[PDB]
C-alpha cells in the first residue's frame, strides 16, 4: 500500500517547479522493492502547455537498455499535491497505452529549490497501490543531494542512507524528447 499523509512543502513555488525543465532522479527509496533487482534510471520534465500542467516521465534500464516514456495531464489536489493520469508513449508522442481509469500516480512535492527537490510518489496501475516511492530530484544529474534536501528527508522521518543512488548506474537521458513530450 501507499502513504497519503506526505506533506507538501509550505510555500511551494509552482512557477519555479513547473518551468518545463528536466529533473533527474539522483536518489530514491522504494518501499516496495521487486523480487527481481533492476538498477534504474529516471528523469522527468514538469511544465505547462496548452493551459494545463503536464509532466513527462522517462525510465531507462542500463542493463537492458530498455526505455519507456509516459506523458500525463496533472490535476492539482492542493499546491504541491498532484494526480497524474499517464499514457505510455513512443519518444515521439505515439500512444502505446492510452489513459485508463485504473492507471495514475500521485505525488507530493515535499521540498523544492531552484536546483533540487524531494517528492513522494504513489503509482497505481490497474487500481491497486503499487507502493511508496521517495525521490531526490536535481536539475543537474551529477549533483549529490545538498544539505537542504537531506534535512527535508530527515524531516519526513526517513533515512537518506536508505536511499539508493543512481549516480554510477551508467544512466543515459533523452532530455530533448522529454521536453517535447510536454506538448503531447
Ligand atoms: C520520478 C518519479 C517517478 C515517477 C513519477 C514514476 C512513475 C512511474 C509510472 C507512471 C510508471 C508506469 C509506466 C507505464 O506503464 O506506462 C512507472 C513504472 C516503473 N517505474 Fe517508475 N516512476 C518514478 C521513478 C522510478 C524510479 C527511481 C525507479 C527505480 C526504482 C522506478 C522503477 C519503475 C519500474 C520497475 C517500473 C515498471 C513497474 C510497473 O509497471 O509496475 N520508477 N513509474
UniProtKB/Swiss-Prot annotation:
One of its GO terms (molecular function) is histamine binding. InterPro entries: Calycin, Nitrophorin, Nitrophorin_domain. Disulfide bonds join 2-122, 41-171. It comes from Rhodnius prolixus. The lineage of its organism: Eukaryota, Metazoa, Ecdysozoa, Arthropoda, Hexapoda. It is found in: Secreted. This is Nitrophorin-1. It holds the Pfam family Nitrophorin. Heme binds at residue 59. Keywords: Disulfide bond, Heme, Iron, Metal-binding, Secreted, Signal, Vasoactive, Vasodilator. Belongs to the calycin superfamily. Nitrophorin family. Heme-based protein that deliver nitric oxide gas (NO) to the victim while feeding, resulting in vasodilation and inhibition of platelet aggregation. Reversibly binds nitric oxide (NO). Also binds tightly to histamine, which is released by the host to induce wound healing. Salivary gland (at protein level). Its main location: secreted.
Amino acid at each position: 500500500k501507499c502513504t497519503k499523509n506526505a506533506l507538501a512543502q509550505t510555500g511551494f513555488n509552482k512557477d519555479k517547479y513547473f518551468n518545463g525543465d528536466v529533473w533527474y532522479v539522483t536518489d530514491y527509496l522504494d518501499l516496495e522493492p521487486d523480487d527481481v533487482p533492476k538498477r534504474y534510471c529516471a528523469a522527468l520534465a514538469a511544465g505547462t502547455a496548452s493551459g494545463k500542467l503536464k509532466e513527462a516521465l522517462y525510465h531507462y534500464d542500463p542493463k537492458t537498455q530498455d526505455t519507456f516514456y509516459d506523458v500525463s495531464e496533472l490535476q492539482e489536489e492542493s499546491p504541491g499535491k498532484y494526480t497524474a493520469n499517464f499514457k505510455k508513449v513512443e519518444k515521439n508522442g505515439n500512444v502505446k497505452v492510452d489513459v485508463t481509469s485504473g492507471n495514475y500516480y500521485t505525488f507530493t512535492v515535499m521540498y523544492a529549490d531552484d536546483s533540487s527537490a524531494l517528492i513522494h510518489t504513489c503509482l497505481h496501475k490497474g487500481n491497486k497501490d503499487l507502493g511508496d516511492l521517495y525521490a531526490v530530484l536535481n536539475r543537474n544529474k551529477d549533483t549529490n543531494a545538498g544539505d537542504k534536501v537531506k534535512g527535508a528527508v530527515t524531516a519526513a522521518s526517513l533515512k537518506f542512507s536508505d536511499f539508493i543512488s543512481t549516480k554510477d548506474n551508467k544512466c543515459e537521458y533523452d532530455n530533448v524528447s522529454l521536453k517535447s513530450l510536454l506538448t503531447k
